[PDB]
Amino acid sequence: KNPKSDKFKVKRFHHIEFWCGDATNVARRFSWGLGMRFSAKSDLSTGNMVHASYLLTSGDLRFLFTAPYSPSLSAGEIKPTTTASIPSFDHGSCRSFFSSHGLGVRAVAIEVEDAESAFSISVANGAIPSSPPIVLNEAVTIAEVKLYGDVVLRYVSYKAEEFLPGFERVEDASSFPLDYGIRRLDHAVGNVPELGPALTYVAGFTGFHQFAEFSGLNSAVLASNDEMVLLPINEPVHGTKRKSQIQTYLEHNEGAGLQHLALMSEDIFRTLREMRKRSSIGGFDFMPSPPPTYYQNLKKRVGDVLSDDQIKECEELGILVDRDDQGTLLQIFTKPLGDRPTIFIEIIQRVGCMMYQSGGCGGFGKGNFSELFKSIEEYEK
Amino acid sequence: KNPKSDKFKVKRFHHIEFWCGDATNVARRFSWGLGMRFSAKSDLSTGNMVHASYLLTSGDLRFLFTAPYSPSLSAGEIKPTTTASIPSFDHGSCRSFFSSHGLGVRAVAIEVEDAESAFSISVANGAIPSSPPIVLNEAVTIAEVKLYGDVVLRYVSYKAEEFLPGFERVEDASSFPLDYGIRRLDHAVGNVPELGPALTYVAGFTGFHQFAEFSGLNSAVLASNDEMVLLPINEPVHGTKRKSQIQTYLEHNEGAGLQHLALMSEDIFRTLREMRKRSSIGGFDFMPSPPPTYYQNLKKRVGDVLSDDQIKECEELGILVDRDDQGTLLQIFTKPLGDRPTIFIEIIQRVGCMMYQSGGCGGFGKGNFSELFKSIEEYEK
Numbered sequence A, B: 001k002n003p004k005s006d007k008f009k010v011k012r013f014h015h016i017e018f019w020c021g022d023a024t025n026v027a028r029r030f031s032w033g034l035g036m037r038f039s040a041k042s043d044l045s046t047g048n049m050v051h052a053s054y055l056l057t058s059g060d061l062r063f064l065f066t067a068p069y070s071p072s073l074s075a076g077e078i079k080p081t082t083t084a085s086i087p088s089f090d091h092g093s094c095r096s097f098f099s100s101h102g103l104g105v106r107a108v109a110i111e112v113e114d115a116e117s118a119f120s121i122s123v124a125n126g127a128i129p130s131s132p133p134i135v136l137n138e139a140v141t142i143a144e145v146k147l148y149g150d151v152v153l154r155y156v157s158y159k160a161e162e163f164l165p166g167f168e169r170v171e172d173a174s175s176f177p178l179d180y181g182i183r184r185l186d187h188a189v190g191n192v193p194e195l196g197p198a199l200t201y202v203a204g205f206t207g208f209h210q211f212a213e214f215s216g217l218n219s220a221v222l223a224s225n226d227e228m229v230l231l232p233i234n235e236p237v238h239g240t241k242r243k244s245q246i247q248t249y250l251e252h253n254e255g256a257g258l259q260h261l262a263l264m265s266e267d268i269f270r271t272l273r274e275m276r277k278r279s280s281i282g283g284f285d286f287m288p289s290p291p292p293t294y295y296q297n298l299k300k301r302v303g304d305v306l307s308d309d310q311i312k313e314c315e316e317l318g319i320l321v322d323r324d325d326q327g328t329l330l331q332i333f334t335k336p337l338g339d340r341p342t343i344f345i346e347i348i349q350r351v352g353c354m355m356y357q358s359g360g361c362g363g364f365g366k367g368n369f370s371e372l373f374k375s376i377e378e379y380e381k
């Protein structure tokens, strides 16, 4: 069931913005680890005396890394005379965010038809305003409302049809064309103390509907009309034998925030080969692999979708597989992206639901909680 | 002239500690960019609820990257019950340092015979105490005094004869054996507003002597008895046609701090080949190369030290060459290591002064200020 209840026209995920202490080092690490190209910049060299912002791209995936400069460089500016390219940026907010939460996602940005309308309708329907609509160079409108914790949902709309005015394309010499196959953001997941109030709030101001589904958590997924913007939310389940990873997140993050970004690959085997080659030379580490019992059990579960060789390739790379009533999901999780056991990345590829592929084909892998549990006990035997 | 006036027994540079917002991402970037191996850690996985600290090594060079966790994880601790492995660490100091200065060096650590004695003698001779001597596991003593700005000179002494108690050696799987030829810290350089008072202060409490030398700055070099610990200091020269890079540093750094680390390579050609291969894939960028006039002029200056092929290899890699009355210096400078135009790295190799090689052989490259100026005008013609 999809009531198509969006209160404003939503297109696709546009970008994810990380708030950093040093944007250069995080961006360079992420570029090498994920195979993303340096695409645009806004910093001292482009006249921005307020913040350093670096954009990485892979296909349609856009990761932005932003850090504040010394406020002294811009102490004579006021908002009408600002040299910031992102007018919602605030030195104090950014330092406070980073000191509270560590490295993490500040903004989940979606492209909409009209960011001013999206903002107005959102706030009229209960959204907490974070940054009012501002028109940049008569070309792009950006607005922000609170999503959960200190994460904002950012609306971006373009008059035309390059990232944002005031960003400059990066010189080709500094722009090595890395590509490990990642192509777009599939979903972005928040952790909260209480799922109910978080869902009611977000669904209330967006009109996003609950996406039909089918340890240590309860979850639900909010989706736009064409189910291409997917915003799952988790809450902890307390009292369990094993401590909830959602609760650990909330403790180390100092509350609610973005838990994981799931990045679609056009070839998850190539993506994982390339990422695993770089894990110990500056890239990202992956969660410990499931026991061989897990891959022995894949024949019964997905032997009609994956060949024995493709299954054994999943086993070499530690890839998990789950299945819906409509499609199949290949997925794997990185270790946390930074110092704290908080945000991590998921790499996914979806098989099925061809019409274009429909959103959320194969689900989100919740069946892998029981399958992992089973395969662990089976391997113990 | 070397009066050998050290007020306590100094051995060698021991490590450099960076204070970070996220130690993981900075350490992984530096590891790949410089060819340093992950050697030790102190973090949540080792029981440290206070700070995340990661040690990189290349030869005798030790770079430590430290960031604070949420204070909530350790809110019940007091100093007698701390789980920090570096007892001088303070959440507030670290956040304040990073918010003021951005990514940069907090501690220049030298190994001494007796860190408690070094501390006491230093303070008795004018050093501003920063952290009193603390004995770790009855095995290592660490103490800190102010050096300049918010940079401390850290004394470390060992009863024995592994990094520090509470650090664990890094698993081999996570410890890829990168090596681009870097072998030790040659010198560590501070920028200050006024050279005179800074020299008087540091030489006053160390007994370090002025190392015999032979644009936009005045400088002097303080040296230990065997001239193996080398601490140059720069001040800006104002009114110049071109704005002093020392003054730009002080503005963007919010005052005095560490300007550059010079890392000795056992093969600067290999080091620069390896670093330049990685500049645009997560590593470090280098300053723009000098004009070919500079390398045309190298024959007259160092043609008795470098062959034509070795000179042309300097030209391919952008390496600068200077000469003392005793030796020759090969050097090159990176672009700033992070967002701010503040700290950068120098790669150096020294030729001559064989006895072992004596410290500071060939100087610090101050002759390259005029040689670069000349070669630029000559290439314009």
Ligand SMILES: Cc1c(C(=O)C2=C(O)CCCC2=O)ccc2c1c(=O)n(-c1cccc3ccccc13)c(=O)n2C
Pocket: A187, A189, A215, A216, A219, A220, A232, A233, A234, A245, A260, A262, A287, A333, A346, A364, A365, A366, A368, A369, A372
């Ligand atoms: C994050 C995730 C997803 C997922 O993507 C998802 C949504 O997108 C939206 C719905 C809720 C939802 O969970 C799916 C399966 C997962 C995990 C996941 O994180 N993990 C864990 C990985 C590593 C260490 C763990 C430690 C304790 C507990 C779980 C750990 C799993 O095992 N499975 C099986």
Ligand SMILES: Cc1c(C(=O)C2=C(O)CCCC2=O)ccc2c1c(=O)n(-c1cccc3ccccc13)c(=O)n2C
Pocket: B187, B189, B215, B216, B219, B220, B232, B233, B234, B245, B260, B262, B287, B333, B346, B364, B365, B366, B368, B369, B372
């Ligand atoms: C840092 C340095 C050293 C050096 O290592 C040293 C000591 O160790 C101790 C004594 C003082 C001292 O300077 C030597 C020569 C240098 C530079 C240096 O930084 N630069 C610059 C590089 C790039 C952009 C510049 C822009 C403006 C002005 C100078 C720029 C140079 O050109 N030369 C020639």
Ligand SMILES: [Co+2]
Pocket: A187, A189, A260, A262, A346, A364
């Ligand atoms: Co997911």
Ligand SMILES: [Co+2]
Pocket: B187, B189, B260, B262, B346, B364
């Ligand atoms: Co130098």
